[PDB]
């Protein structure tokens, strides 16, 4: 409907796949080469389904900060025959607050879904499902089951992936450029 939704759509149309684990279907963001991200609670194993095709997992790393606190991001390298468009130049370098963000989801349950969530707070610490978690972004939208892995964007930036909600607020794990240096 406007330039926020434009940037979000450009990311969804080229840089997402539908990932299925034993714990559900998730929006999955492809970042560069065969490297993607997914919430750690997806419990990625040795094999994952990517757009309903059986795919070997070459590597999976559940990220934690240097205090050994959960960040809820798993970086996955996929045994796929095709690379993602490199979007690392759209990743923020530092922790920050944002205005006017969009949360975008694409699954069998919620295809082509876009939500204007408004202001995004650098919330920091969250007890997420009982697990102490750092680098959380918060938005005041009543997000639901099915939105985990959803991509959070502003114009020109891919800032996080949706990881939870409390019925009134939604929470995303930050994406930082430093996670994907090689």
Curated annotation (Swiss-Prot):
The active site is at 41 (for protease 3c activity), 72 (for protease 3c activity), 148 (for protease 3c activity). It catalyses: Selective cleavage of Gln-|-Gly bond in the poliovirus polyprotein. In other picornavirus reactions Glu may be substituted for Gln, and Ser or Thr for Gly. Residues 2-180 form the Peptidase C3 domain. It is found in: Host cytoplasm. It comes from the Viruses. Major viral protease that mediates proteolytic processing of the polyprotein. Cleaves host EIF5B, contributing to host translation shutoff. Also cleaves host PABPC1, contributing to host translation shutoff. Binds and inhibits host IFIH1/MDA5, thereby inhibiting the type-I IFN production and the establishment of the antiviral state. Cleaves host MAP3K7/TAK1, resulting in inhibition of TRAF6-triggered NF-kappa-B induction. Cleaves host TICAM1; this interaction allows the virus to disrupt host TLR3 signaling. Cleaves host IRF7, resulting in inhibition of type-I IFN production. Interacts with host IFIH1/MDA5; this interaction inhibits host IFIH1. This is Protease 3C. It comes from Human enterovirus D68. The lineage of its organism: Viruses, Riboviria, Orthornavirae, Pisuviricota, Pisoniviricetes. The chain holds residues 1549 to 1729 of 2188 of the full protein.
């Amino acid at each position: 409907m406007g330039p926020g939704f434009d940037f979000a759509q450009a990311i969804m149309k080229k840089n997402t796949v539908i990932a299925r684990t034993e714990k559900g279907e998730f929006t999955m963001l492809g970042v560069y080469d065969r490297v993607a991200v997914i919430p750690t609670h997806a419990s990625v194993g040795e094999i994952i389904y990517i757009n309903d095709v059986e795919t070997r997992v070459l590597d999976a790393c559940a990220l934690r900060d240097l205090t050994d606190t959960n960040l809820e991001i798993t970086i996955v390298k996929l045994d796929r025959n095709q690379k993602f468009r490199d979007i690392r130049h759209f990743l923020p370098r530092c922790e920050d607050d944002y205005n006017d963000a969009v949360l975008s989801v694409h699954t069998s349950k919620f295809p082509n879904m876009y939500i204007p969530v408004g202001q995004v707070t650098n919330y920091g610490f969250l007890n997420l499902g009982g697990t102490p978690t750092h680098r959380i972004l918060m938005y005041n939208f009543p997000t639901r089951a099915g939105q985990c892995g959803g991509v959070v964007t502003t114009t020109g930036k891919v800032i996080g992936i949706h990881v939870g909600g409390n019925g009134a607020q939604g929470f995303a794990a930050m994406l930082l450029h430093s996670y994907f240096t090689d």
